Amino acid sequence: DSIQAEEWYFGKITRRESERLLLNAENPRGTFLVRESETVKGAYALSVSDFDNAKGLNVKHYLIRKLDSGGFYITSRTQFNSLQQLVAYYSKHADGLCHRLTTVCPTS
Template identity: 45%
Template sequence: WNVVSLVTGKECSVPSSHVAKVWHRWLYEGVSREKAEELLLLPCNHSGSFLIRESQTRQGCYSLSVRRTNLSSWDSVKHYRINRLENGWLYIAPRLTFPSLQELVDYYSEIGDGLCCLLKEPCFIQGAVQVPAQNLALPVVVKKSSLNWQELDSSALFSEAPAPAGESPVSLGLREAISSYLFLTEELPPEKGEKGRLWKCA
């Protein structure tokens, strides 16, 4: 499947085994029981949040997963099997049948009738609301000329005074790295020649 990020607008491919279809905001295809619990227990969902998913054990049947609040413990998810009759009608309790999933959802949204709570709102998935991509400014690239170690004044390496912005050929990070290296190896800075340049050791 080809998918597009709602944030960045970039397109990429996703294996079909990692894709779930969502219908009516509450009907999920390709979602396991464990994944349904994970989604419903997200902080953006509350007691009464629900989803309907294809049954993993009975072909042609569905399961209703509902988040409920437990006053004495953490929120949990209750699952109900939605069975299908030979005539295509659906039911949770045999005494009450519905011609479609939409009729079933509408009924249990108004009357609990044996469920742990009323169906209040479909499971909300973070990122489902489109967020406009921000036009972030690109970082400024500063290109300096190549550093010639033969002509470098040692004072640029060992000076503790901060150099004016853009004037020092050696970055602060490089100076700190060299200072740390010399400190760890317990060696003194190399001696300067007559013109203040670094001497090479044979």
């Protein structure tokens, strides 16, 4: 219920560590996690594995903005009341991302 209970929530890990976890060649395309942003205080980052036509296995990082008035978004036109809801939504369809979210990042 709290974000801290969610298996895809890794909290305060670095961008480099997110890539280490996500770049496993075993992870399906759209393997993901959510971490605290290291660039924007109080924001989150959605880190997603991908297979790029030119660069092969790569990780894409999307900034999730947090509103003081409540709510989260990658883009202000598609807002959610929780990170849980945002994850559910992007798990259904890419809607802009490199791929829909498919697999919770296996751990380390």
